[model samples]
Target: AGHMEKQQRKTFTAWCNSHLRKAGTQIENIEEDFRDGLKLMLLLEVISGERLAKPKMRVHKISNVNKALDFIASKGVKLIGAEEIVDGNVKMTLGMIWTIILRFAIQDISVEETSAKEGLLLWCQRKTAPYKNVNIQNFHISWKDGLGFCALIHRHRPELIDYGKLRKDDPLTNLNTAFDVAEKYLDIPKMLDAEDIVGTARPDEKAIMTYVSSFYHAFSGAQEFLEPG
Candidate 1:
């Protein structure tokens, strides 16, 4: 009898927790509705990404959008309208963006393919090169610094898409030339100074190029994926 009474009490509590008679709905049902709404909100955030707040972000000028789009299109790709890209029919992922940037960087450089591949490989090596015996905390600091530098560049100079040309008129030209001239000689000093963190520690120019290239690839893919159907 005692066990049976305990079970009954538990069942009653569970029922009370799940239902609201005055509201004409179960608590579980309400929770499900709230969860659905939250999910939709998150989806909207991702679908809109950075492009959604252009006006508020002060990127509303037609010239800025056109310049960005033109640079993107130059890699032999087309920009799709944001509404079409995020129709919720197709899923978008980070990998898609990387693929698009690589496609763009490598699009018409076959005339000097060997140099292009070499530059890319060298840059990758530099980024992934683990600092010898550094603690996880310091490693994280370094990583964050690198990311922050990239973000600063993105936010301030949205017009400066061709990172390889930081030293010259066209940084997107042959990869090696761009890296040696622009990144190695010029950008790193500025990046380190901007962050107010100084050390012998410097990112390889090639690595910086690769990092930016990776972002460009990702952005391109996401941009394309977001286009209307």
Candidate 2:
């Protein structure tokens, strides 16, 4: 099992390097990024494992890996494997953790590609559905439209959005809170003006990278206690 795991890691690292190169990023930088992601994943697994191992919640089952992957992918992240991350030998960050989870979740469900996307969405919706009062309308809508709605709220009702209360309310609220916090800290007009420079002419790579990186920082900061010792 150990040997197999090592082999798997090596394969993933090769894959990541190839993918990044194809995407026109520097190979060295990609490797470094992977290393950081690996470190973060290790730290998260350790901290979460320790907490969940307690007698109160001894057996933990991740039933909806696909859903988790979908959630991460929706954020414009690509999930990489553990072996790939470890091979890069980088210190992990919160962004990397989400990437790992998202990657693994998708990989886990890849065997059934046709149903994987929907399955993952369904699972994710189910996981958080109970916490919110709304009926499960459409996972795709929830994933995409929900984000749009939150953006609209942040732009229009910044004062009405209660950051603290949203955090404590439910998963939906927590997600919205993220948008609220982002809008509060981010410089909108400047960001808008800088969008062309940030992203490519058509896609906007600069803005995308900035957004993802910022999210990684914020998420990691929120869980600083989980870092490896």
Q: How close is every model to the real structure, measured as TM-score?
A: 0.21, 0.26
Residue 224 error, candidate 2, Å: 14
Residues 111-203 of candidate 1 have per-residue lDDT tens digits of 224334454443333433443321222221343233333332333344543433333222123223322333343232111122222222443
RMSD of each: 21.4, 16.1
- The model with the greatest lDDT is 2
C-alpha lDDT of all candidate models, in order: 0.31, 0.34
Each prediction's number of clashing residue pairs: 12, 16
lDDT of 2: 0.34
